[PDB]
Symmetry: C3
């Protein structure tokens, strides 16, 4: 049916429904760091959540990327993103400017993936 | 196949495909009210649409929340959101700042849910 | 399983999983043009991608529309959008203000569709 993982009153980090994995929005850990390091931390977090969900980063379907300042940080975010996935397995992607819930958060990813 | 409900030339409020429910973006009713009351009105609207789609608020998979001013209204929106769903059934969630189509609209939700 | 089309290191334009089509974010071609012409170009691009994915514009499930300036361009975007699809087949829709990766880009669409 529906499986939920890492749940509190506000959200589940992982929701799995009929083979599709929906992740809560993910942000980085170090609030003093630039967009490159925050993006690395986001991608590490996503990998951990995909492990728990029962899939892996070659089965990502669609990612929406929110940047606090797209003019400042698009290129730095891309420099990390473009190295993340094996060639041939990149998902659909969309990248837009939207402030996150704290001013030090420079990047947030919303991920949809697939179970094997 | 695909079922559509509450359809005009621009959008359907409800689209159901192979067990997944996609709702049009939902906003509140009272444009003079604060983010808490607008969020309550949004959640009521979502519940009505889920009723029509054939599911309920314990089967929500992923919600993206847009706030006109995330610094001003994140906490007020959360105060309503956090009370909405039974413990254990919260969906994936992402919350970002994006202006809605009228300046008095403080919050808009995009919902993906599942049929039983 | 998962089919990917028009793939580079950063993204696939088309990802198909278990009957659901996820498109990469689409923008227009003419950066000097207004939101109406850019929206037309976006919709043409979407139609080409849906052709490749094996579906068509009457099987769109959900679209999120990002506008650089929602106050300026909501109405112009709508004037094109509202004419696009046969009556009765409109998807779920959400429209918000989010800057795209270049200042001349006025509109970007993220599309989820269904295979027949």
């Amino acid at each position: 049916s529906i499986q939920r993982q890492l749940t509190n009153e506000r959200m589940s980090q992982v929701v799995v429904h009929n083979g599709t994995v929906y992740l809560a929005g993910q942000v980085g850990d170090d609030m003093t760091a630039g967009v490159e390091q925050q993006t690395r931390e986001v991608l590490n977090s996503i990998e951990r959540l995909l492990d728990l969900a029962g899939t892996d980063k070659t089965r990502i379907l669609s990612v929406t990327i929110y940047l606090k300042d797209i003019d400042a940080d698009f290129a730095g975010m891309n420099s990390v993103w473009d190295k993340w996935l094996p060639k041939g397995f990149a998902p659909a992607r969309a990248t837009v400017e939207a402030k996150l819930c704290e001013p030090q958060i420079l990047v947030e990813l919303s991920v949809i993936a697939a179970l094997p």
